[PDB]
């Protein structure tokens, strides 16, 4: 029920900037721009990560305590915003949450979007200071945001570069630019490395740890939660990979993995199932901004019944996660994680 406190946190941060030694008119331009940056990119999502903080906190309460908990929830949503803006610059996105990517806007462009990624990212730490500077968990909380972010950056790095010629640097080459798949990297082990780092830590481990830290939980439970977070991050990204091909942009709110030369679960599954001749077709057709090329890939995914293989992967993983959840021996958190698991795809 933390949707109502958004304005407070936004305004707290905008107030900080408003204290700057700047002319009044300039300050007006600043608040106008940054009010839009926050609203445009922090709102519209399922808010799964934010809600997770609130639920964990509650199940591990006066209105002053909620203020801290909800601050941390919105801090994770602001992190999510920073990530999506950056991710859309990097992957040249078109749409995100059913509207134009921030960086594509003529009043914004790549140059502002880059600066804005940093602003959103830093605003998180200023908010945590404002609301949590006097909590004993303060240092641990900022360290958790920091470390999860580091993992995400490394995951994003691998996702971006896994098929590049440097993973198969020339500091004198600024002239000769071509995306190709590298068959050696088309396997589940590599994929899990990538997805766990890119997704699991900030989407699951972080929000859960925030709730627990603030609740006053060193304790061996933190390790168990790290392990469950990994299973969930993988479950989550594979489902994201599945929708990229077999979903409607109307539901996902975003437009392209194939033409973007991404290592995805459907590519890895197809690759392990298909004939040698189709391995050659994939190589020849993947990662090409060309209609005929992506259609070839689409057809292979249908040919090799990827829908069916996802349907049964989902079953096995959901059972493996439920089994890891039961071994936590904490009634409250177990409930939250089972609930999260149900609500994952819809919010």
Ligand X SMILES: CCCCCCCCOc1cccc(COc2ccc(S(=O)(=O)N3CCOCC3)cc2C(=O)O)c1
Binding mask 170-199 for a second copy (x = CB under 8 A): xxxxxxxx-----------xx--x--xx--
Rg (CA), the chain: 21
Residue list 197-236, contact with ligand X (CB under 6 A): 198-199, 203
Token pair recorded at residue 343: 């609500």
Residue with tokens 């189709």: 278
Which residue is associated with the tokens 């830093």? Answer: 122
Q: Pick what 198 binds: a second copy, ligand X, none; C-beta below 5 to 8 Å, kind-dependent.
A: ligand X
Distance of CA 173 to the CA centre of its chain: 32
**Given candidates 67, 91, 140, 334, which one binds a second copy under the rule CB under 8 A?**
91
CB 152 within 8 A of CB 201: yes
From the CB of 153, what's the least distance to ligand X, in Å? 4
Stretch that binds a second copy, among 156-164, 214-222, 241-249, 281-289 (CB under 8 A): 156-164
Residue 31 Cα distances to 11, 19, 41, 112, angstroms: 9, 11, 15, 15
* Residue 329 makes contact with ligand X by CB under 6 A: no
Dist CA 281 CA 67 (whole Å): 55
Q: Interface with a second copy includes 97 (CB under 8 A)?
A: no
Residue 98 engages ligand X in binding (rule: CB under 6 A)? no
Residue whose CB is less far from a second copy, 142 or 221: 142
Angle of CA points 202, 203, 206, to nearest 5°: 50
Q: Is 218 assigned to a binding site? A: no
CB of 79 to ligand X, least distance (A): 7
Q: What are phi and psi of 99, to 5 degrees?
A: -150, 165
- What is the torsional sign of CA 179, 167, 313, 227? negative
Cβ(279)–Cβ(183) below 8 Å = yes
Restricting to residues 136-175, name those near ligand X by CB under 6 A. 152-153, 156, 160
Taking the least distance from each CB to ligand X, the nearer of 155 and 300 is: 155
Q: Which of ligand X, a second copy, none lies near 46, with the C-beta cut-off 5 to 8 A by kind?
A: ligand X
Q: Is 110 near a second copy (CB under 8 A)? A: yes
Minimum CB separation of residue 11 from a second copy in Å reads: 16
- Counting contacts by CB under 6 A, is residue 278 touching ligand X? no
Torsion angles phi and psi, residue 47, rounded to 5: 65, 25
Task: Select from 31-39, 76-84, 137-145, 214-222 the region that touches ligand X (CB under 6 A).
Answer: 76-84
How far apart CA 147 and CA 321 sit, in angstroms, is: 24
Contact of 286 with 181, CB cutoff 8 Å: yes
Indicate which of a second copy, ligand X, none lies near residue 164 (CB less than 5 to 8 Å, by partner kind): a second copy
CB 249, CB 95: distance < 8 Å: yes
Does the annotation list 107 as a binding residue? no
* Residues paired with residue 99 on neighbouring β-strands, in sequence order: 96
Of 36, 43, 221, 293, which lies in the binding site for a second copy, with binding defined by CB under 8 A? Answer: 36
* By CB under 8 A, residue 157 contacts a second copy: yes
Which residues bind to ligand X, rule: CB under 6 A?
45-46, 48, 80, 82-84, 86-87, 90, 97, 111-112, 115, 117-118, 121, 152-153, 156, 160, 198-199, 203
């Amino acid at each position: 029920f933390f949707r109502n406190m958004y304005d407070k946190y936004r305004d707290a941060f905008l107030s900080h900037l408003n204290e700057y030694s700047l002319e009044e008119e300039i300050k007006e331009h600043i608040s106008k721009y940054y009010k839009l940056l926050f609203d445009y990119n922090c709102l519209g999502g399922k808010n799964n990560r934010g809600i997770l903080v609130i639920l964990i906190y509650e199940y591990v309460i006066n209105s002053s305590e909620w203020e801290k908990a909800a601050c941390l929830a919105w801090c994770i949503e602001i992190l999510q915003a920073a990530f999506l803006v950056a991710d859309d610059i990097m992957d040249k996105g078109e749409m995100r949450r059913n509207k134009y990517c921030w960086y594509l806007l003529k009043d914004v462009e790549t140059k502002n979007a880059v600066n804005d990624v940093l602003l959103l990212y830093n605003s998180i730490y200023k908010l945590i200071e404002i609301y949590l500077r006097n909590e004993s968990c303060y240092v641990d909380v900022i360290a958790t945001f920091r470390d999860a972010t580091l993992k995400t950056i490394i995951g994003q790095h691998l996702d971006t570069n896994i098929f590049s010629d440097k993973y198969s640097i020339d500091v004198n080459n600024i002239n000769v630019p071509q995306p190709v798949i590298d068959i050696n990297m088309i396997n589940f082990g590599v994929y899990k490395n990538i997805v766990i780092h890119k997704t699991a830590y900030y989407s699951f481990f972080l929000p859960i740890v925030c709730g627990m830290l603030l609740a006053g939980i060193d304790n061996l439970i933190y390790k168990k939660i790290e392990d469950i977070s990994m299973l969930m991050g993988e479950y989550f990204q594979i489902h994201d990979d599945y929708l990229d091909i077999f979903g409607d942009s109307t539901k996902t709110g975003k437009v392209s993995d194939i033409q973007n030369n991404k290592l995805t679960w459907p590519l890895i599954k197809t690759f392990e199932l298909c004939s040698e001749p189709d391995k050659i077709k994939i190589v020849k057709n993947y990662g090409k901004n060309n209609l005929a090329c992506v259609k070839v890939i689409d057809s292979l995914y249908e040919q090799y019944k990827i829908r069916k293989h996802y349907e049964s992967y989902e079953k096995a993983q959901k059972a493996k996660i439920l089994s890891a959840i039961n071994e936590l021996h904490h009634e409250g958190i177990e409930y939250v994680l089972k609930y999260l698991l149900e609500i994952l795809f819809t919010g």
